[PDB]
Design an enzyme around this catalytic site. Structure first.
Site, mmCIF file in Angstrom:
data_model
loop_
_atom_site.group_PDB
_atom_site.id
_atom_site.type_symbol
_atom_site.label_atom_id
_atom_site.label_comp_id
_atom_site.label_asym_id
_atom_site.label_seq_id
_atom_site.Cartn_x
_atom_site.Cartn_y
_atom_site.Cartn_z
ATOM 1 N N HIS A 8 11.926 2.524 0.678
ATOM 2 C CA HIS A 8 13.534 2.718 0.077
ATOM 3 C C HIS A 8 13.775 4.593 0.194
ATOM 4 C CE1 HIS A 8 11.112 5.697 -2.510
ATOM 5 N NE2 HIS A 8 10.284 5.219 -1.774
ATOM 6 N N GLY A 9 15.209 4.396 -0.071
ATOM 7 C CA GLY A 9 15.308 6.030 0.895
ATOM 8 C C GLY A 9 14.914 6.709 -0.474
ATOM 9 N N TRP A 13 10.607 12.434 -6.929
ATOM 10 C CA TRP A 13 9.303 12.391 -6.640
ATOM 11 C C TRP A 13 8.924 12.549 -4.948
ATOM 12 C CZ3 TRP A 13 6.803 9.261 -10.995
ATOM 13 C CH2 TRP A 13 6.925 10.068 -12.080
ATOM 14 N N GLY A 21 4.791 5.549 -8.133
ATOM 15 C CA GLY A 21 4.105 3.647 -7.838
ATOM 16 C C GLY A 21 4.728 2.919 -8.336
ATOM 17 N N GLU A 74 5.360 -0.981 -4.366
ATOM 18 C CA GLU A 74 3.941 0.092 -4.373
ATOM 19 C C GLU A 74 2.910 0.053 -5.306
ATOM 20 O OE1 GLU A 74 2.589 1.965 -2.290
ATOM 21 O OE2 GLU A 74 4.211 3.558 -1.882
ATOM 22 N N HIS A 76 0.139 0.853 -8.064
ATOM 23 C CA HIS A 76 0.499 1.076 -9.410
ATOM 24 C C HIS A 76 -1.055 2.271 -9.572
ATOM 25 C CE1 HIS A 76 0.058 0.248 -14.118
ATOM 26 N NE2 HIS A 76 0.936 1.591 -13.903
#
Length: 169
Positions: A8-9, A13, A21, A74, A76
């Site tokens: 993802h772009g 964070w 996550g 992603e 957790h």
């Protein structure tokens, strides 16, 4: 089988080096720009995406209409969600850098995480583009004898389950 793994772009964070996550952060403006740059650059194969916002949004801006699957999420991080990498206890910092023996309190173990990732790949019957996360891409690269923390907004193509084909950044 040709699988394209797209991270993802950028989110906030990701800049700030925070563990991200299951926290559902949105893309930053630059993250959206990165996602739009992927449009037309990736083959228009059937698409699948983690159901987290930043993955879904990257797929959309990249010109895809993915099916959503929680298995592409992603890892957790549980109580470590948003944890500052700087002050991260050494035991977790070491486990992450090595990508082994890691189980964030309240979150997923590396072993449970990698099992759901590889078992999702098991169900793919034809080449596809997967909008997902850095931990997912790393699990695949490491299994294939390579490593890499791929940047947000970039993609890797691999010939599962044999080898890596190309990294597009």
């Amino acid at each position: 089988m040709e699988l394209w793994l797209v991270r993802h772009g950028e989110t906030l964070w990701n800049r700030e080096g925070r563990l991200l996550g299951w926290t559902d952060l949105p893309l930053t403006a630059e993250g959206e720009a990165q996602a739009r740059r992927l449009k037309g650059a990736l083959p228009s194969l059937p698409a699948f995406s983690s159901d987290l916002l930043r993955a879904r949004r990257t797929a959309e801006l990249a010109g895809f209409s993915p099916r959503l699957y929680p298995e592409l999420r992603e890892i957790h991080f549980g109580a470590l969600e948003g944890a500052l990498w700087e002050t991260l206890d050494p035991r977790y910092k070491e486990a992450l850098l090595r990508f082994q023996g890691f189980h964030p309190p309240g979150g997923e173990s590396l072993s449970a995480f990698q099992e759901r990732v590889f078992r999702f790949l098991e169900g793919l019957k034809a080449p596809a583009v997967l909008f997902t996360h850095g931990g997912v891409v790393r699990a695949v690269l490491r299994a294939l004898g390579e490593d890499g923390l791929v940047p947000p907004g970039s993609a890797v193509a691999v010939d599962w389950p044999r080898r890596v084909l190309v990294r597009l950044a």
